[PDB]
Design a protein around this ligand. Structure first.
Ligand SMILES: Cc1cccc2c(=O)[nH]c(-c3ccc(C(F)(F)F)cc3)nc12
Ligand SMILES: [Zn+2]
Length: 208
């Protein structure tokens, strides 16, 4: 039931999504090992992901969380990078898209920094890189990220230098804690708490 609608580069929606992607690039402590060396992307396409069933599943859960949290879903728009991007847009998020080894337990991880999510496009630690060139810093192959609507509800704050949410909470917030430049990371434990709204196809660009 999923359809992908292309956004025109002239469309204001295209532009605000591209700005959030571009402006949330930062330097990483691995020096580019996992996600490659770049300061910006070449955006090739942005598509709206439309699936009535997944949307209703998301809104239903959103309403449950909101009613547990003084009518506040604490909804964010966050990046997600995964080798399973193609299953997620068709079937939604679930237990099979969890990161079992994650630092906040086995849940589904999301980032404010687009460049953090870029590190997982080819797998954990960037895996072995693009399938064509086996290169984690490939400047040629097309990459995809999701920009997702995520319900955090009451989020447990972890200061940091499928399982369950900590009791009384709906999510975990990974607060950046030595690297003063890093934005937060977030984890949910129910797939119904995210909807994959935009599919962004891009390349990382080699610095000149
Ligand atoms: C940790 C973390 C922080 C912020 C953003 C992300 C993010 O966007 N993706 C992943 C990610 C990790 C593993 C898998 C896999 F096991 F392959 F299914 C998929 C996605 N981790 C993140
Ligand atoms: Zn490649």
């Amino acid at each position: 039931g999923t359809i992908l609608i292309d956004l025109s580069p002239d469309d204001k929606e295209f532009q605000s999504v591209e700005e959030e992607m571009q402006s949330t690039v930062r330097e990483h402590r691995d020096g580019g090992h996992a996600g490659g060396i770049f300061n910006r992307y070449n955006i090739l396409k942005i598509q709206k992901v439309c699936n009535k069933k997944l949307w209703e599943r998301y809104t239903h859960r959103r309403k449950e969380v909101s009613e547990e949290n003084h009518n506040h879903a604490n909804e964010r728009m966050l990046f997600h990078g995964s080798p399973f991007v193609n299953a997620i847009i068709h079937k939604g998020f679930d237990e099979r898209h969890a990161y079992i080894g994650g630092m906040f337990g086995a849940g589904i991880y999301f980032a404010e920094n687009s460049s953090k999510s870029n590190q997982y496009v080819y797998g954990i630690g960037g895996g072995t890189g693009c399938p064509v060139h086996k290169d984690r810093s490939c400047y040629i192959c097309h990459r995809q990220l999701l920009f997702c609507r995520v319900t955090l509800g009451k989020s447990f704050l972890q200061f940091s230098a499928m399982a369950h949410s900590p009791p009384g909470h709906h999510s975990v917030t990974g607060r950046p804690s030595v690297n003063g430049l890093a934005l937060a990371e977030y984890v949910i434990y129910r797939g119904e708490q995210a909807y994959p709204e935009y599919l962004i196809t891009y390349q990382i660009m080699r610095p000149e």
